[PDB]
Design a protein around this nucleic acid. Structure first.
Length: 47
RNA sequence: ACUCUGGUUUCUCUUCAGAUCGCAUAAAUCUUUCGCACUAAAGAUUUCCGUGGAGAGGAACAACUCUGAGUCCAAUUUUUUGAGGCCUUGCUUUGGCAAGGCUA
């Protein structure tokens, strides 16, 4: 109301102190959908 | 149910495309804005990767699939009947016509 080949940590976004946005509560999709590439047994463990 | 067009594939040449021409994303020049410009935004122009529409030429085989075109009802409800004969009046184009009353 009022050369550097790496990327610096000051360029980061989503540094927001919100209880709703840090824990964004991702979906699991009826226990049937899977996130691609991440290991399926590990996804069945972390559900 | 009988016949006549139109093929597919590949190569090359010439035109049009601000259509997500490309369900992906490059490089150069100029101007402006600030930093002090690879770690930066906007505008304009240009170069390369290669594509869709149309037309023309070539040559390898299939010729009529497809796209077209030329080529069983008689019995209510319609097409298997209620059909034909008589009289009066206006005109008779003296053949009969129009209206009404009849018999079947």
């Amino acid at each position: 109301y009022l050369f550097v080949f790496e990327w610096d940590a000051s360029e980061d976004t989503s540094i927001d102190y919100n209880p709703l946005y840090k824990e964004r509560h991702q979906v699991q999709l009826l226990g049937r959908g899977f996130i691609a590439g991440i290991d399926l047994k590990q996804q069945k463990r972390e559900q």
